[PDB]
Design a protein around this nucleic acid. Structure first.
Lengths: 149, 148, 149, 148
DNA sequence: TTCGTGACATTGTCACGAA
DNA sequence: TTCGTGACAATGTCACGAA
DNA sequence: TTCGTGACATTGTCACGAA
DNA sequence: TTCGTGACAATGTCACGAA
């Protein structure tokens, strides 16, 4: 755990979680009835401006099989923040032709390495071609003259 | 255009659109007062089963701040469909590191070509360097052998 | 022929011929009996200083059987003389061991060319040893500084 | 001394010599006189076959101008004899041109080798060159097998 | 001094190719 | 046949170097 | 089990070169 | 205008190997 915790906002974060889903429709509560669950819908809706008070509610009305989906989504956004505190870590997304990907990826999984470097190497292996064209050609074209003189 | 329209469903999306955005907080409505605008929410949040009418709702009810944002976001949800059919047309998202991007994009910036052209051109040439190190490796292997 | 003839002088050495050979122990006359044969001898030595005389003498008197041996021994001196003049013209001999003679003499009957010339080449190519003794030592170094890069 | 000096023939040998130079025109007597010469001539010429005779014939009766001339010419014939046997020790002479002799004799007299040997050592080198140009044809050729 | 030895000069045939 | 020509043969010397 | 993290999926945007 | 389109932003999971 290289990224510290922030009880304050890190809690309000989870709050947004039980919202972004409840909106599109997804059993937030750990109950089955649409009577006991519906009730809980408001039991939290009011905790808007309510910090750590949010945690009090997890042990109360929080669907178990969600604890997984959440942790995974939390840590994620958790890293993005700290990583956004500068540039080198700030990641960016890219869209390219399918077939292209297939190669790349297939080259990442086959070239015992991760995408990143795999892209870093595929580059160095390119700019080197220029001086490798002649480097191999010179040692070959300069000797062609030995056949006679 | 390269793709044709589907009035029946096409408009369908927009619906799915105005709702969505609304669900998150937005005045899809062309009005303001918590009344008239309020009605136009339910008045539209119903054409679900008969979306072939949403269009006539957008032409004289939807907030104009979204006319463009839509024609775009839709025209996209359109291409995104037809390509999602086959495989060669499909697409894929990647998440590479900052540093890389610079150099990477940078190259694509100096050549101008597609950001994908970069992976082709880099694989195509950077792979031809993996070639001369082979013709220069099998050569230094049969050159010195005969010699000593 | 090629050279010239010395009517007077050449009869000179020509004379010494039957002479130096007669005292050696051989028949110069064509008379089996020691009466006419011995007569010719005495009559011969008297010509100690006569040219043309020796000519007619050889005719009626000398043994026309060794003639050939003479025409050969005489022709030689014709040549050994005009040649012995200038240096590059004078011929000279040497004693070589059999072993060595073999190869050499045997390279003449194969290559065809004269014995002398034979040595002329044997030498040139030989002396040229360094010329190609270096081409290798040299040409071969050009490949070493390459294979190791 | 390596050659067993067999007084038997070697003596008779001298004879032919004293006889030869005689038939040519040279004194074979220590006599300061003409006539006195007719003595040795026939006196010795009759020794057609005299061992110990012709021998002492010298210490007591023979020209002095030939004392060394003989001791040496004799050694020659002597060596020629034991040598006449096997061809691997006997010899032959050559008639070569002057100019050739020069270069030849030169290197020979120079390198500090015997005339005969000179040729031998010179032949080896005369072949190496003819051999070195060969390895050139193999290497020069094995370069285009692959290269051009 | 004697001797083994290498370098030539001499001088003589011998079998040949082009007058 | 006639010759210039080349390959060796044979035999004597000479100046050296080790005995 | 809790993390960090990398591989990707959806879906919204907007300048752009023709059409 | 209207399309097709490409570079990224936001962010929600999932199955990994070290803690």
């Amino acid at each position: 755990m290289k990224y510290q915790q922030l009880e304050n906002l890190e809690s309000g974060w989870k709050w947004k979680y039980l919202v972004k889903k409840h909106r599109e429709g997804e059993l937030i509560t750990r109950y089955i009835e649409a009577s006991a669950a519906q009730e809980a819908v408001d039991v939290l809706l009011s905790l808007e401006n309510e910090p750590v008070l949010v945690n009090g509610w997890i042990d109360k009305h929080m669907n178990p099989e969600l604890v997984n989906r959440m942790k995974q989504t939390i840590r994620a956004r958790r890293k993005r923040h700290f990583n956004a505190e500068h540039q080198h870590t700030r990641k960016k997304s890219i869209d390219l032709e399918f077939i292209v990907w297939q190669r790349l990826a297939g080259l990442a999984q086959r070239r015992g390495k991760t995408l990143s470097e795999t892209i870093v190497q595929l580059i160095e292996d390119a700019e080197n071609k220029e001086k490798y064209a002649n480097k191999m050609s010179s040692l070959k074209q300069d000797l062609q003259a030995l056949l006679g003189k």
